[PDB]
């Protein structure tokens, strides 16, 4: 109702589409999420790393920050 998971998945496909020729950024993204999902880094670490993980395409990043709490 606020964040929605279905929208997140749609975003996942969008990333796989653009970087279809470079599945590297994809694996690195999800991998990071799992590291945070388990025990390794924190929230600021995921946001920063991912931000640098998509260096070159401010589009995906712009839409990615939308998910995170604004303010």
């Amino acid at each position: 109702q606020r964040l929605k998971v279905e929208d997140a998945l749609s975003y996942l496909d969008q990333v796989k589409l653009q970087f279809g020729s470079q599945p590297q950024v994809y694996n690195d993204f999800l991998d990071i999420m799992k590291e945070f999902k388990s025990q390794s880094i924190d929230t600021p670490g995921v946001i920063s790393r991912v931000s640098q993980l998509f260096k070159g395409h401010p589009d995906l990043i712009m839409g990615f920050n939308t998910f995170l709490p604004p303010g």
Binding site: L3, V5, L12, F29, F36, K37, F67, L68
Partner: protein, 61 residues
């Protein structure tokens, strides 16, 4: 019963939607006003009075 995509994407995403909200009550601990001490109680109290013929309403009055 319901099989989805790879488990890898399911986990990473789970954390994604959980992180975007894991900063207040969903995961993090802050503001006990919304919902912190009451995650999913059983909802039950001693028979008080007029409030339904379920199992709580004094005794007869």
């Amino acid at each position: 019963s319901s099989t989805w995509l790879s488990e890898a994407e399911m986990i990473a995403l789970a954390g994604l939607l959980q992180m975007s909200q894991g900063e207040q009550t969903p995961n993090c601990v802050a503001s006990s006003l919304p919902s912190t001490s009451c995650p999913d109680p059983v909802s039950v109290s001693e028979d008080p009075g007029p409030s339904g013929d379920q199992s709580c309403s004094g005794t007869d009055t």
